[PDB]
Amino acid sequence: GISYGRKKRRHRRRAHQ
RNA sequence: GGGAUCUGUCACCCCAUUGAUCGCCAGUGGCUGAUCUGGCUGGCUAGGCGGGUCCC
């Protein structure tokens, strides 16, 4: 029906770790 | 071999596409599926692997 996430269109951000 | 730190690599969450590009649909809303940037002053005693350093 509806996704749990509010938007969930961008993620991944830890290249520098 | 273990622990800590850094880097690289592999995933997740939130916000911005009235930030840019591609694809589908449509008169402008939705979809991250890919890449980049900003917020790590955000969550790594939240995870795995490799290398360097230090310690044992």
Side-chain angles (χ1 to χ4, degrees), chain A residues 13-17:
Chain A
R13 213 296 218 73
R14 275 196 156 166
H16 64 281
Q17 192 178 324

mmCIF file with all atom_site columns, all heavy atoms in Angstrom, chain A residues 13-17, chain B residues 6-9 40-44:
data_model
loop_
_atom_site.group_PDB
_atom_site.id
_atom_site.type_symbol
_atom_site.label_atom_id
_atom_site.label_alt_id
_atom_site.label_comp_id
_atom_site.label_asym_id
_atom_site.label_entity_id
_atom_site.label_seq_id
_atom_site.pdbx_PDB_ins_code
_atom_site.Cartn_x
_atom_site.Cartn_y
_atom_site.Cartn_z
_atom_site.occupancy
_atom_site.B_iso_or_equiv
_atom_site.pdbx_formal_charge
_atom_site.auth_seq_id
_atom_site.auth_comp_id
_atom_site.auth_asym_id
_atom_site.auth_atom_id
_atom_site.pdbx_PDB_model_num
ATOM 1   N N     . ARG A 1 13 ? 26.436 6.982  2.383  1.00 0.00 ? 13 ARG A N     1
ATOM 2   C CA    . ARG A 1 13 ? 27.289 8.120  2.644  1.00 0.00 ? 13 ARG A CA    1
ATOM 3   C C     . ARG A 1 13 ? 28.287 7.803  3.760  1.00 0.00 ? 13 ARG A C     1
ATOM 4   O O     . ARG A 1 13 ? 28.135 8.246  4.899  1.00 0.00 ? 13 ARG A O     1
ATOM 5   C CB    . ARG A 1 13 ? 26.423 9.340  3.016  1.00 0.00 ? 13 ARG A CB    1
ATOM 6   C CG    . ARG A 1 13 ? 27.079 10.648 2.531  1.00 0.00 ? 13 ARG A CG    1
ATOM 7   C CD    . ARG A 1 13 ? 28.431 10.885 3.240  1.00 0.00 ? 13 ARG A CD    1
ATOM 8   N NE    . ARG A 1 13 ? 28.608 12.296 3.533  1.00 0.00 ? 13 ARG A NE    1
ATOM 9   C CZ    . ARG A 1 13 ? 27.947 12.956 4.477  1.00 0.00 ? 13 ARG A CZ    1
ATOM 10  N NH1   . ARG A 1 13 ? 27.063 12.334 5.211  1.00 0.00 ? 13 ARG A NH1   1
ATOM 11  N NH2   . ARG A 1 13 ? 28.186 14.222 4.674  1.00 0.00 ? 13 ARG A NH2   1
ATOM 12  N N     . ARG A 1 14 ? 29.316 7.031  3.414  1.00 0.00 ? 14 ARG A N     1
ATOM 13  C CA    . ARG A 1 14 ? 30.350 6.666  4.381  1.00 0.00 ? 14 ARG A CA    1
ATOM 14  C C     . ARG A 1 14 ? 31.648 6.269  3.674  1.00 0.00 ? 14 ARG A C     1
ATOM 15  O O     . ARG A 1 14 ? 32.404 5.417  4.164  1.00 0.00 ? 14 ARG A O     1
ATOM 16  C CB    . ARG A 1 14 ? 29.860 5.515  5.274  1.00 0.00 ? 14 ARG A CB    1
ATOM 17  C CG    . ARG A 1 14 ? 29.049 6.067  6.453  1.00 0.00 ? 14 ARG A CG    1
ATOM 18  C CD    . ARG A 1 14 ? 28.919 4.986  7.510  1.00 0.00 ? 14 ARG A CD    1
ATOM 19  N NE    . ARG A 1 14 ? 28.687 5.574  8.836  1.00 0.00 ? 14 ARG A NE    1
ATOM 20  C CZ    . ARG A 1 14 ? 28.272 4.857  9.875  1.00 0.00 ? 14 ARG A CZ    1
ATOM 21  N NH1   . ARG A 1 14 ? 28.029 3.583  9.734  1.00 0.00 ? 14 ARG A NH1   1
ATOM 22  N NH2   . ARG A 1 14 ? 28.109 5.427  11.037 1.00 0.00 ? 14 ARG A NH2   1
ATOM 23  N N     . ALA A 1 15 ? 31.912 6.892  2.524  1.00 0.00 ? 15 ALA A N     1
ATOM 24  C CA    . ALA A 1 15 ? 33.121 6.593  1.769  1.00 0.00 ? 15 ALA A CA    1
ATOM 25  C C     . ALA A 1 15 ? 34.353 6.909  2.612  1.00 0.00 ? 15 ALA A C     1
ATOM 26  O O     . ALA A 1 15 ? 35.307 6.129  2.634  1.00 0.00 ? 15 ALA A O     1
ATOM 27  C CB    . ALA A 1 15 ? 33.149 7.413  0.480  1.00 0.00 ? 15 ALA A CB    1
ATOM 28  N N     . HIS A 1 16 ? 34.311 8.042  3.323  1.00 0.00 ? 16 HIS A N     1
ATOM 29  C CA    . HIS A 1 16 ? 35.426 8.440  4.189  1.00 0.00 ? 16 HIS A CA    1
ATOM 30  C C     . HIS A 1 16 ? 35.546 7.513  5.410  1.00 0.00 ? 16 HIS A C     1
ATOM 31  O O     . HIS A 1 16 ? 36.617 7.407  6.012  1.00 0.00 ? 16 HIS A O     1
ATOM 32  C CB    . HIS A 1 16 ? 35.242 9.899  4.642  1.00 0.00 ? 16 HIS A CB    1
ATOM 33  C CG    . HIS A 1 16 ? 33.996 10.043 5.485  1.00 0.00 ? 16 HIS A CG    1
ATOM 34  N ND1   . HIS A 1 16 ? 32.729 10.120 4.927  1.00 0.00 ? 16 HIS A ND1   1
ATOM 35  C CD2   . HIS A 1 16 ? 33.811 10.117 6.844  1.00 0.00 ? 16 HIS A CD2   1
ATOM 36  C CE1   . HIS A 1 16 ? 31.846 10.239 5.936  1.00 0.00 ? 16 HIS A CE1   1
ATOM 37  N NE2   . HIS A 1 16 ? 32.454 10.242 7.126  1.00 0.00 ? 16 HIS A NE2   1
ATOM 38  N N     . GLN A 1 17 ? 34.439 6.847  5.760  1.00 0.00 ? 17 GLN A N     1
ATOM 39  C CA    . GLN A 1 17 ? 34.412 5.932  6.898  1.00 0.00 ? 17 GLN A CA    1
ATOM 40  C C     . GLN A 1 17 ? 34.938 6.623  8.156  1.00 0.00 ? 17 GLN A C     1
ATOM 41  O O     . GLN A 1 17 ? 34.156 6.814  9.074  1.00 0.00 ? 17 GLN A O     1
ATOM 42  C CB    . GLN A 1 17 ? 35.261 4.699  6.588  1.00 0.00 ? 17 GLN A CB    1
ATOM 43  C CG    . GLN A 1 17 ? 35.007 3.620  7.642  1.00 0.00 ? 17 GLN A CG    1
ATOM 44  C CD    . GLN A 1 17 ? 35.804 2.362  7.309  1.00 0.00 ? 17 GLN A CD    1
ATOM 45  O OE1   . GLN A 1 17 ? 35.962 2.014  6.138  1.00 0.00 ? 17 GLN A OE1   1
ATOM 46  N NE2   . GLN A 1 17 ? 36.320 1.653  8.276  1.00 0.00 ? 17 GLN A NE2   1
ATOM 47  P P     . C   B 2 6  ? 38.948 6.899  12.814 1.00 0.00 ? 6  C   B P     1
ATOM 48  O OP1   . C   B 2 6  ? 38.222 8.195  12.847 1.00 0.00 ? 6  C   B OP1   1
ATOM 49  O OP2   . C   B 2 6  ? 38.180 5.628  12.774 1.00 0.00 ? 6  C   B OP2   1
ATOM 50  O "O5'" . C   B 2 6  ? 39.944 6.920  11.574 1.00 0.00 ? 6  C   B "O5'" 1
ATOM 51  C "C5'" . C   B 2 6  ? 40.835 8.014  11.384 1.00 0.00 ? 6  C   B "C5'" 1
ATOM 52  C "C4'" . C   B 2 6  ? 41.781 7.729  10.247 1.00 0.00 ? 6  C   B "C4'" 1
ATOM 53  O "O4'" . C   B 2 6  ? 42.625 6.607  10.600 1.00 0.00 ? 6  C   B "O4'" 1
ATOM 54  C "C3'" . C   B 2 6  ? 41.146 7.301  8.940  1.00 0.00 ? 6  C   B "C3'" 1
ATOM 55  O "O3'" . C   B 2 6  ? 40.655 8.420  8.203  1.00 0.00 ? 6  C   B "O3'" 1
ATOM 56  C "C2'" . C   B 2 6  ? 42.311 6.611  8.243  1.00 0.00 ? 6  C   B "C2'" 1
ATOM 57  O "O2'" . C   B 2 6  ? 43.246 7.535  7.704  1.00 0.00 ? 6  C   B "O2'" 1
ATOM 58  C "C1'" . C   B 2 6  ? 42.943 5.858  9.425  1.00 0.00 ? 6  C   B "C1'" 1
ATOM 59  N N1    . C   B 2 6  ? 42.457 4.429  9.554  1.00 0.00 ? 6  C   B N1    1
ATOM 60  C C2    . C   B 2 6  ? 43.038 3.433  8.764  1.00 0.00 ? 6  C   B C2    1
ATOM 61  O O2    . C   B 2 6  ? 43.950 3.746  7.982  1.00 0.00 ? 6  C   B O2    1
ATOM 62  N N3    . C   B 2 6  ? 42.592 2.161  8.870  1.00 0.00 ? 6  C   B N3    1
ATOM 63  C C4    . C   B 2 6  ? 41.609 1.868  9.724  1.00 0.00 ? 6  C   B C4    1
ATOM 64  N N4    . C   B 2 6  ? 41.199 0.600  9.791  1.00 0.00 ? 6  C   B N4    1
ATOM 65  C C5    . C   B 2 6  ? 41.000 2.863  10.544 1.00 0.00 ? 6  C   B C5    1
ATOM 66  C C6    . C   B 2 6  ? 41.451 4.119  10.426 1.00 0.00 ? 6  C   B C6    1
ATOM 67  P P     . U   B 2 7  ? 39.416 8.233  7.193  1.00 0.00 ? 7  U   B P     1
ATOM 68  O OP1   . U   B 2 7  ? 39.055 9.578  6.674  1.00 0.00 ? 7  U   B OP1   1
ATOM 69  O OP2   . U   B 2 7  ? 38.383 7.406  7.871  1.00 0.00 ? 7  U   B OP2   1
ATOM 70  O "O5'" . U   B 2 7  ? 40.026 7.385  5.995  1.00 0.00 ? 7  U   B "O5'" 1
ATOM 71  C "C5'" . U   B 2 7  ? 41.076 7.922  5.199  1.00 0.00 ? 7  U   B "C5'" 1
ATOM 72  C "C4'" . U   B 2 7  ? 41.602 6.880  4.244  1.00 0.00 ? 7  U   B "C4'" 1
ATOM 73  O "O4'" . U   B 2 7  ? 42.206 5.800  5.000  1.00 0.00 ? 7  U   B "O4'" 1
ATOM 74  C "C3'" . U   B 2 7  ? 40.571 6.180  3.383  1.00 0.00 ? 7  U   B "C3'" 1
ATOM 75  O "O3'" . U   B 2 7  ? 40.201 6.971  2.253  1.00 0.00 ? 7  U   B "O3'" 1
ATOM 76  C "C2'" . U   B 2 7  ? 41.308 4.905  2.995  1.00 0.00 ? 7  U   B "C2'" 1
ATOM 77  O "O2'" . U   B 2 7  ? 42.304 5.128  2.002  1.00 0.00 ? 7  U   B "O2'" 1
ATOM 78  C "C1'" . U   B 2 7  ? 41.974 4.552  4.336  1.00 0.00 ? 7  U   B "C1'" 1
ATOM 79  N N1    . U   B 2 7  ? 41.132 3.640  5.206  1.00 0.00 ? 7  U   B N1    1
ATOM 80  C C2    . U   B 2 7  ? 41.182 2.279  4.971  1.00 0.00 ? 7  U   B C2    1
ATOM 81  O O2    . U   B 2 7  ? 41.879 1.785  4.102  1.00 0.00 ? 7  U   B O2    1
ATOM 82  N N3    . U   B 2 7  ? 40.386 1.519  5.791  1.00 0.00 ? 7  U   B N3    1
ATOM 83  C C4    . U   B 2 7  ? 39.562 1.974  6.800  1.00 0.00 ? 7  U   B C4    1
ATOM 84  O O4    . U   B 2 7  ? 38.902 1.165  7.454  1.00 0.00 ? 7  U   B O4    1
ATOM 85  C C5    . U   B 2 7  ? 39.569 3.393  6.978  1.00 0.00 ? 7  U   B C5    1
ATOM 86  C C6    . U   B 2 7  ? 40.334 4.164  6.197  1.00 0.00 ? 7  U   B C6    1
ATOM 87  P P     . G   B 2 8  ? 38.741 6.789  1.602  1.00 0.00 ? 8  G   B P     1
ATOM 88  O OP1   . G   B 2 8  ? 38.588 7.819  0.544  1.00 0.00 ? 8  G   B OP1   1
ATOM 89  O OP2   . G   B 2 8  ? 37.749 6.713  2.704  1.00 0.00 ? 8  G   B OP2   1
ATOM 90  O "O5'" . G   B 2 8  ? 38.825 5.363  0.905  1.00 0.00 ? 8  G   B "O5'" 1
ATOM 91  C "C5'" . G   B 2 8  ? 39.736 5.135  -0.165 1.00 0.00 ? 8  G   B "C5'" 1
ATOM 92  C "C4'" . G   B 2 8  ? 39.769 3.670  -0.512 1.00 0.00 ? 8  G   B "C4'" 1
ATOM 93  O "O4'" . G   B 2 8  ? 40.287 2.932  0.613  1.00 0.00 ? 8  G   B "O4'" 1
ATOM 94  C "C3'" . G   B 2 8  ? 38.434 3.013  -0.783 1.00 0.00 ? 8  G   B "C3'" 1
ATOM 95  O "O3'" . G   B 2 8  ? 37.977 3.268  -2.107 1.00 0.00 ? 8  G   B "O3'" 1
ATOM 96  C "C2'" . G   B 2 8  ? 38.766 1.537  -0.572 1.00 0.00 ? 8  G   B "C2'" 1
ATOM 97  O "O2'" . G   B 2 8  ? 39.434 0.970  -1.690 1.00 0.00 ? 8  G   B "O2'" 1
ATOM 98  C "C1'" . G   B 2 8  ? 39.735 1.620  0.616  1.00 0.00 ? 8  G   B "C1'" 1
ATOM 99  N N9    . G   B 2 8  ? 39.089 1.361  1.913  1.00 0.00 ? 8  G   B N9    1
ATOM 100 C C8    . G   B 2 8  ? 38.626 2.282  2.819  1.00 0.00 ? 8  G   B C8    1
ATOM 101 N N7    . G   B 2 8  ? 38.097 1.739  3.880  1.00 0.00 ? 8  G   B N7    1
ATOM 102 C C5    . G   B 2 8  ? 38.220 0.373  3.663  1.00 0.00 ? 8  G   B C5    1
ATOM 103 C C6    . G   B 2 8  ? 37.824 -0.724 4.471  1.00 0.00 ? 8  G   B C6    1
ATOM 104 O O6    . G   B 2 8  ? 37.268 -0.704 5.576  1.00 0.00 ? 8  G   B O6    1
ATOM 105 N N1    . G   B 2 8  ? 38.133 -1.946 3.875  1.00 0.00 ? 8  G   B N1    1
ATOM 106 C C2    . G   B 2 8  ? 38.749 -2.082 2.654  1.00 0.00 ? 8  G   B C2    1
ATOM 107 N N2    . G   B 2 8  ? 38.967 -3.339 2.242  1.00 0.00 ? 8  G   B N2    1
ATOM 108 N N3    . G   B 2 8  ? 39.123 -1.066 1.891  1.00 0.00 ? 8  G   B N3    1
ATOM 109 C C4    . G   B 2 8  ? 38.829 0.124  2.453  1.00 0.00 ? 8  G   B C4    1
ATOM 110 P P     . U   B 2 9  ? 36.401 3.288  -2.419 1.00 0.00 ? 9  U   B P     1
ATOM 111 O OP1   . U   B 2 9  ? 36.231 3.672  -3.844 1.00 0.00 ? 9  U   B OP1   1
ATOM 112 O OP2   . U   B 2 9  ? 35.723 4.077  -1.358 1.00 0.00 ? 9  U   B OP2   1
ATOM 113 O "O5'" . U   B 2 9  ? 35.979 1.765  -2.258 1.00 0.00 ? 9  U   B "O5'" 1
ATOM 114 C "C5'" . U   B 2 9  ? 36.519 0.756  -3.104 1.00 0.00 ? 9  U   B "C5'" 1
ATOM 115 C "C4'" . U   B 2 9  ? 36.087 -0.606 -2.615 1.00 0.00 ? 9  U   B "C4'" 1
ATOM 116 O "O4'" . U   B 2 9  ? 36.652 -0.849 -1.304 1.00 0.00 ? 9  U   B "O4'" 1
ATOM 117 C "C3'" . U   B 2 9  ? 34.599 -0.789 -2.403 1.00 0.00 ? 9  U   B "C3'" 1
ATOM 118 O "O3'" . U   B 2 9  ? 33.940 -1.052 -3.636 1.00 0.00 ? 9  U   B "O3'" 1
ATOM 119 C "C2'" . U   B 2 9  ? 34.557 -1.975 -1.451 1.00 0.00 ? 9  U   B "C2'" 1
ATOM 120 O "O2'" . U   B 2 9  ? 34.783 -3.201 -2.119 1.00 0.00 ? 9  U   B "O2'" 1
ATOM 121 C "C1'" . U   B 2 9  ? 35.757 -1.658 -0.537 1.00 0.00 ? 9  U   B "C1'" 1
ATOM 122 N N1    . U   B 2 9  ? 35.372 -0.954 0.747  1.00 0.00 ? 9  U   B N1    1
ATOM 123 C C2    . U   B 2 9  ? 34.899 -1.718 1.798  1.00 0.00 ? 9  U   B C2    1
ATOM 124 O O2    . U   B 2 9  ? 34.797 -2.931 1.738  1.00 0.00 ? 9  U   B O2    1
ATOM 125 N N3    . U   B 2 9  ? 34.550 -1.007 2.920  1.00 0.00 ? 9  U   B N3    1
ATOM 126 C C4    . U   B 2 9  ? 34.623 0.358  3.094  1.00 0.00 ? 9  U   B C4    1
ATOM 127 O O4    . U   B 2 9  ? 34.271 0.853  4.165  1.00 0.00 ? 9  U   B O4    1
ATOM 128 C C5    . U   B 2 9  ? 35.125 1.074  1.961  1.00 0.00 ? 9  U   B C5    1
ATOM 129 C C6    . U   B 2 9  ? 35.474 0.414  0.852  1.00 0.00 ? 9  U   B C6    1
ATOM 130 P P     . C   B 2 40 ? 28.758 18.086 9.316  1.00 0.00 ? 40 C   B P     1
ATOM 131 O OP1   . C   B 2 40 ? 28.632 18.174 10.787 1.00 0.00 ? 40 C   B OP1   1
ATOM 132 O OP2   . C   B 2 40 ? 29.849 18.825 8.629  1.00 0.00 ? 40 C   B OP2   1
ATOM 133 O "O5'" . C   B 2 40 ? 28.856 16.543 8.927  1.00 0.00 ? 40 C   B "O5'" 1
ATOM 134 C "C5'" . C   B 2 40 ? 30.095 15.951 8.556  1.00 0.00 ? 40 C   B "C5'" 1
ATOM 135 C "C4'" . C   B 2 40 ? 30.378 14.797 9.472  1.00 0.00 ? 40 C   B "C4'" 1
ATOM 136 O "O4'" . C   B 2 40 ? 29.414 13.764 9.213  1.00 0.00 ? 40 C   B "O4'" 1
ATOM 137 C "C3'" . C   B 2 40 ? 31.746 14.120 9.311  1.00 0.00 ? 40 C   B "C3'" 1
ATOM 138 O "O3'" . C   B 2 40 ? 32.635 14.531 10.352 1.00 0.00 ? 40 C   B "O3'" 1
ATOM 139 C "C2'" . C   B 2 40 ? 31.448 12.608 9.406  1.00 0.00 ? 40 C   B "C2'" 1
ATOM 140 O "O2'" . C   B 2 40 ? 32.146 12.003 10.476 1.00 0.00 ? 40 C   B "O2'" 1
ATOM 141 C "C1'" . C   B 2 40 ? 29.942 12.570 9.711  1.00 0.00 ? 40 C   B "C1'" 1
ATOM 142 N N1    . C   B 2 40 ? 29.209 11.410 9.108  1.00 0.00 ? 40 C   B N1    1
ATOM 143 C C2    . C   B 2 40 ? 28.799 10.334 9.942  1.00 0.00 ? 40 C   B C2    1
ATOM 144 O O2    . C   B 2 40 ? 29.056 10.354 11.163 1.00 0.00 ? 40 C   B O2    1
ATOM 145 N N3    . C   B 2 40 ? 28.131 9.306  9.397  1.00 0.00 ? 40 C   B N3    1
ATOM 146 C C4    . C   B 2 40 ? 27.860 9.291  8.101  1.00 0.00 ? 40 C   B C4    1
ATOM 147 N N4    . C   B 2 40 ? 27.179 8.258  7.629  1.00 0.00 ? 40 C   B N4    1
ATOM 148 C C5    . C   B 2 40 ? 28.249 10.340 7.230  1.00 0.00 ? 40 C   B C5    1
ATOM 149 C C6    . C   B 2 40 ? 28.911 11.372 7.758  1.00 0.00 ? 40 C   B C6    1
ATOM 150 P P     . U   B 2 41 ? 33.396 15.960 10.287 1.00 0.00 ? 41 U   B P     1
ATOM 151 O OP1   . U   B 2 41 ? 33.189 16.547 8.934  1.00 0.00 ? 41 U   B OP1   1
ATOM 152 O OP2   . U   B 2 41 ? 34.781 15.768 10.790 1.00 0.00 ? 41 U   B OP2   1
ATOM 153 O "O5'" . U   B 2 41 ? 32.592 16.857 11.342 1.00 0.00 ? 41 U   B "O5'" 1
ATOM 154 C "C5'" . U   B 2 41 ? 32.923 16.829 12.736 1.00 0.00 ? 41 U   B "C5'" 1
ATOM 155 C "C4'" . U   B 2 41 ? 31.746 17.277 13.576 1.00 0.00 ? 41 U   B "C4'" 1
ATOM 156 O "O4'" . U   B 2 41 ? 31.400 18.646 13.330 1.00 0.00 ? 41 U   B "O4'" 1
ATOM 157 C "C3'" . U   B 2 41 ? 30.451 16.552 13.300 1.00 0.00 ? 41 U   B "C3'" 1
ATOM 158 O "O3'" . U   B 2 41 ? 30.430 15.321 14.013 1.00 0.00 ? 41 U   B "O3'" 1
ATOM 159 C "C2'" . U   B 2 41 ? 29.372 17.552 13.797 1.00 0.00 ? 41 U   B "C2'" 1
ATOM 160 O "O2'" . U   B 2 41 ? 28.806 17.154 15.031 1.00 0.00 ? 41 U   B "O2'" 1
ATOM 161 C "C1'" . U   B 2 41 ? 30.162 18.860 13.995 1.00 0.00 ? 41 U   B "C1'" 1
ATOM 162 N N1    . U   B 2 41 ? 29.454 20.070 13.436 1.00 0.00 ? 41 U   B N1    1
ATOM 163 C C2    . U   B 2 41 ? 28.529 20.725 14.225 1.00 0.00 ? 41 U   B C2    1
ATOM 164 O O2    . U   B 2 41 ? 28.258 20.369 15.359 1.00 0.00 ? 41 U   B O2    1
ATOM 165 N N3    . U   B 2 41 ? 27.933 21.814 13.638 1.00 0.00 ? 41 U   B N3    1
ATOM 166 C C4    . U   B 2 41 ? 28.165 22.303 12.369 1.00 0.00 ? 41 U   B C4    1
ATOM 167 O O4    . U   B 2 41 ? 27.547 23.293 11.978 1.00 0.00 ? 41 U   B O4    1
ATOM 168 C C5    . U   B 2 41 ? 29.137 21.569 11.619 1.00 0.00 ? 41 U   B C5    1
ATOM 169 C C6    . U   B 2 41 ? 29.736 20.502 12.160 1.00 0.00 ? 41 U   B C6    1
ATOM 170 P P     . G   B 2 42 ? 30.086 13.938 13.268 1.00 0.00 ? 42 G   B P     1
ATOM 171 O OP1   . G   B 2 42 ? 30.011 12.897 14.324 1.00 0.00 ? 42 G   B OP1   1
ATOM 172 O OP2   . G   B 2 42 ? 31.060 13.783 12.165 1.00 0.00 ? 42 G   B OP2   1
ATOM 173 O "O5'" . G   B 2 42 ? 28.614 14.118 12.661 1.00 0.00 ? 42 G   B "O5'" 1
ATOM 174 C "C5'" . G   B 2 42 ? 27.554 14.556 13.506 1.00 0.00 ? 42 G   B "C5'" 1
ATOM 175 C "C4'" . G   B 2 42 ? 26.373 13.604 13.453 1.00 0.00 ? 42 G   B "C4'" 1
ATOM 176 O "O4'" . G   B 2 42 ? 25.711 13.689 12.177 1.00 0.00 ? 42 G   B "O4'" 1
ATOM 177 C "C3'" . G   B 2 42 ? 26.723 12.131 13.575 1.00 0.00 ? 42 G   B "C3'" 1
ATOM 178 O "O3'" . G   B 2 42 ? 26.954 11.814 14.948 1.00 0.00 ? 42 G   B "O3'" 1
ATOM 179 C "C2'" . G   B 2 42 ? 25.496 11.440 12.993 1.00 0.00 ? 42 G   B "C2'" 1
ATOM 180 O "O2'" . G   B 2 42 ? 24.498 11.198 13.971 1.00 0.00 ? 42 G   B "O2'" 1
ATOM 181 C "C1'" . G   B 2 42 ? 24.980 12.487 11.978 1.00 0.00 ? 42 G   B "C1'" 1
ATOM 182 N N9    . G   B 2 42 ? 25.110 12.057 10.572 1.00 0.00 ? 42 G   B N9    1
ATOM 183 C C8    . G   B 2 42 ? 26.060 12.437 9.657  1.00 0.00 ? 42 G   B C8    1
ATOM 184 N N7    . G   B 2 42 ? 25.913 11.868 8.493  1.00 0.00 ? 42 G   B N7    1
ATOM 185 C C5    . G   B 2 42 ? 24.793 11.062 8.647  1.00 0.00 ? 42 G   B C5    1
ATOM 186 C C6    . G   B 2 42 ? 24.148 10.201 7.722  1.00 0.00 ? 42 G   B C6    1
ATOM 187 O O6    . G   B 2 42 ? 24.449 9.975  6.543  1.00 0.00 ? 42 G   B O6    1
ATOM 188 N N1    . G   B 2 42 ? 23.043 9.566  8.285  1.00 0.00 ? 42 G   B N1    1
ATOM 189 C C2    . G   B 2 42 ? 22.621 9.745  9.583  1.00 0.00 ? 42 G   B C2    1
ATOM 190 N N2    . G   B 2 42 ? 21.536 9.047  9.950  1.00 0.00 ? 42 G   B N2    1
ATOM 191 N N3    . G   B 2 42 ? 23.214 10.544 10.455 1.00 0.00 ? 42 G   B N3    1
ATOM 192 C C4    . G   B 2 42 ? 24.285 11.167 9.924  1.00 0.00 ? 42 G   B C4    1
ATOM 193 P P     . G   B 2 43 ? 27.911 10.582 15.330 1.00 0.00 ? 43 G   B P     1
ATOM 194 O OP1   . G   B 2 43 ? 28.168 10.651 16.791 1.00 0.00 ? 43 G   B OP1   1
ATOM 195 O OP2   . G   B 2 43 ? 29.059 10.577 14.388 1.00 0.00 ? 43 G   B OP2   1
ATOM 196 O "O5'" . G   B 2 43 ? 27.043 9.286  15.046 1.00 0.00 ? 43 G   B "O5'" 1
ATOM 197 C "C5'" . G   B 2 43 ? 25.907 9.025  15.870 1.00 0.00 ? 43 G   B "C5'" 1
ATOM 198 C "C4'" . G   B 2 43 ? 25.216 7.755  15.447 1.00 0.00 ? 43 G   B "C4'" 1
ATOM 199 O "O4'" . G   B 2 43 ? 24.632 7.921  14.153 1.00 0.00 ? 43 G   B "O4'" 1
ATOM 200 C "C3'" . G   B 2 43 ? 26.134 6.564  15.290 1.00 0.00 ? 43 G   B "C3'" 1
ATOM 201 O "O3'" . G   B 2 43 ? 26.422 5.973  16.552 1.00 0.00 ? 43 G   B "O3'" 1
ATOM 202 C "C2'" . G   B 2 43 ? 25.291 5.637  14.414 1.00 0.00 ? 43 G   B "C2'" 1
ATOM 203 O "O2'" . G   B 2 43 ? 24.381 4.873  15.185 1.00 0.00 ? 43 G   B "O2'" 1
ATOM 204 C "C1'" . G   B 2 43 ? 24.504 6.646  13.551 1.00 0.00 ? 43 G   B "C1'" 1
ATOM 205 N N9    . G   B 2 43 ? 24.981 6.726  12.170 1.00 0.00 ? 43 G   B N9    1
ATOM 206 C C8    . G   B 2 43 ? 25.849 7.643  11.631 1.00 0.00 ? 43 G   B C8    1
ATOM 207 N N7    . G   B 2 43 ? 26.099 7.436  10.368 1.00 0.00 ? 43 G   B N7    1
ATOM 208 C C5    . G   B 2 43 ? 25.349 6.310  10.051 1.00 0.00 ? 43 G   B C5    1
ATOM 209 C C6    . G   B 2 43 ? 25.214 5.610  8.825  1.00 0.00 ? 43 G   B C6    1
ATOM 210 O O6    . G   B 2 43 ? 25.752 5.853  7.738  1.00 0.00 ? 43 G   B O6    1
ATOM 211 N N1    . G   B 2 43 ? 24.353 4.521  8.940  1.00 0.00 ? 43 G   B N1    1
ATOM 212 C C2    . G   B 2 43 ? 23.704 4.163  10.098 1.00 0.00 ? 43 G   B C2    1
ATOM 213 N N2    . G   B 2 43 ? 22.909 3.084  10.020 1.00 0.00 ? 43 G   B N2    1
ATOM 214 N N3    . G   B 2 43 ? 23.822 4.806  11.248 1.00 0.00 ? 43 G   B N3    1
ATOM 215 C C4    . G   B 2 43 ? 24.654 5.862  11.152 1.00 0.00 ? 43 G   B C4    1
ATOM 216 P P     . C   B 2 44 ? 27.943 5.633  16.946 1.00 0.00 ? 44 C   B P     1
ATOM 217 O OP1   . C   B 2 44 ? 27.900 4.773  18.153 1.00 0.00 ? 44 C   B OP1   1
ATOM 218 O OP2   . C   B 2 44 ? 28.706 6.907  16.984 1.00 0.00 ? 44 C   B OP2   1
ATOM 219 O "O5'" . C   B 2 44 ? 28.489 4.756  15.734 1.00 0.00 ? 44 C   B "O5'" 1
ATOM 220 C "C5'" . C   B 2 44 ? 29.885 4.728  15.442 1.00 0.00 ? 44 C   B "C5'" 1
ATOM 221 C "C4'" . C   B 2 44 ? 30.299 3.341  15.023 1.00 0.00 ? 44 C   B "C4'" 1
ATOM 222 O "O4'" . C   B 2 44 ? 29.982 3.154  13.629 1.00 0.00 ? 44 C   B "O4'" 1
ATOM 223 C "C3'" . C   B 2 44 ? 31.803 3.023  15.118 1.00 0.00 ? 44 C   B "C3'" 1
ATOM 224 O "O3'" . C   B 2 44 ? 32.078 2.234  16.273 1.00 0.00 ? 44 C   B "O3'" 1
ATOM 225 C "C2'" . C   B 2 44 ? 32.130 2.239  13.837 1.00 0.00 ? 44 C   B "C2'" 1
ATOM 226 O "O2'" . C   B 2 44 ? 32.651 0.957  14.126 1.00 0.00 ? 44 C   B "O2'" 1
ATOM 227 C "C1'" . C   B 2 44 ? 30.760 2.081  13.172 1.00 0.00 ? 44 C   B "C1'" 1
ATOM 228 N N1    . C   B 2 44 ? 30.809 2.073  11.668 1.00 0.00 ? 44 C   B N1    1
ATOM 229 C C2    . C   B 2 44 ? 30.679 0.845  10.977 1.00 0.00 ? 44 C   B C2    1
ATOM 230 O O2    . C   B 2 44 ? 30.531 -0.208 11.626 1.00 0.00 ? 44 C   B O2    1
ATOM 231 N N3    . C   B 2 44 ? 30.745 0.836  9.627  1.00 0.00 ? 44 C   B N3    1
ATOM 232 C C4    . C   B 2 44 ? 30.942 1.972  8.951  1.00 0.00 ? 44 C   B C4    1
ATOM 233 N N4    . C   B 2 44 ? 31.016 1.908  7.620  1.00 0.00 ? 44 C   B N4    1
ATOM 234 C C5    . C   B 2 44 ? 31.078 3.227  9.608  1.00 0.00 ? 44 C   B C5    1
ATOM 235 C C6    . C   B 2 44 ? 31.005 3.237  10.948 1.00 0.00 ? 44 C   B C6    1
#
